[PDB]
Amino acid sequence: DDDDDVSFCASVQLHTAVEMHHWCIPFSVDGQPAPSLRWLFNGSVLNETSFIFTEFLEPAANETVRHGCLRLNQPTHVNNGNYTLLAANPCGQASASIMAAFMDNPF
């Protein structure tokens, strides 16, 4: 009846965005039941674009942690606000918040 008894719930680790033109917010979310990862931006639903994209990198089969980065190839000063990662799986929902400074100087 059980094929996967191991129910690892989702915990969310976020990391400070690294300042470089291609901004990267590295994340680590662990769990075997796959949690839905959603970014919240200033309390509003952040939807990924071609400029702002969530990277899901291939984890090792021996680690329970899923890794990735919210990478912004082309950053915009409207992104200068609060980011929050919500991961929800059957066991539970985890959250971590990241407030990054995307400050542009037009032209």
From Swiss-Prot:
Domain Ig-like C2-type: 23-89
Note: Trk also stands for tropomyosin-related kinase since it was first isolated as an oncogenic protein which was the result of a fusion between the tropomyosin gene TPM3 and NTRK1.
Tissue specificity remark: Isoform TrkA-I is found in most non-neuronal tissues. Isoform TrkA-II is primarily expressed in neuronal cells. TrkA-III is specifically expressed by pluripotent neural stem and neural crest progenitors.
Record family assignment: Belongs to the protein kinase superfamily. Tyr protein kinase family. Insulin receptor subfamily.
Residues of the full protein shown: 282 to 383 of 796
Lineage: Eukaryota, Metazoa, Chordata, Craniata, Vertebrata
Cell location: Cell membrane; Early endosome membrane; Late endosome membrane; Recycling endosome membrane
Function: Receptor tyrosine kinase involved in the development and the maturation of the central and peripheral nervous systems through regulation of proliferation, differentiation and survival of sympathetic and nervous neurons. High affinity receptor for NGF which is its primary ligand. Can also bind and be activated by NTF3/neurotrophin-3. However, NTF3 only supports axonal extension through NTRK1 but has no effect on neuron survival. Upon dimeric NGF ligand-binding, undergoes homodimerization, autophosphorylation and activation.
Disulfide bonds: C24-C69
Disease as annotated in the protein's UniProt record: Congenital insensitivity to pain with anhidrosis: Characterized by a congenital insensitivity to pain, anhidrosis (absence of sweating), absence of reaction to noxious stimuli, self-mutilating behavior, and intellectual disability. This rare autosomal recessive disorder is also known as congenital sensory neuropathy with anhidrosis or hereditary sensory and autonomic neuropathy type IV or familial dysautonomia type II.
Name the UniProt record assigns to this protein: High affinity nerve growth factor receptor
Gene: NTRK1
Organism (species): Homo sapiens (Human)
Entry comment, domain topic: The transmembrane domain mediates interaction with KIDINS220.
PTM characteristics: Ligand-mediated autophosphorylation. Interaction with SQSTM1 is phosphotyrosine-dependent. N-glycosylated. Isoform TrkA-I and isoform TrkA-II are N-glycosylated.
Residues modified by glycosylation: N42, N47, N62, N82
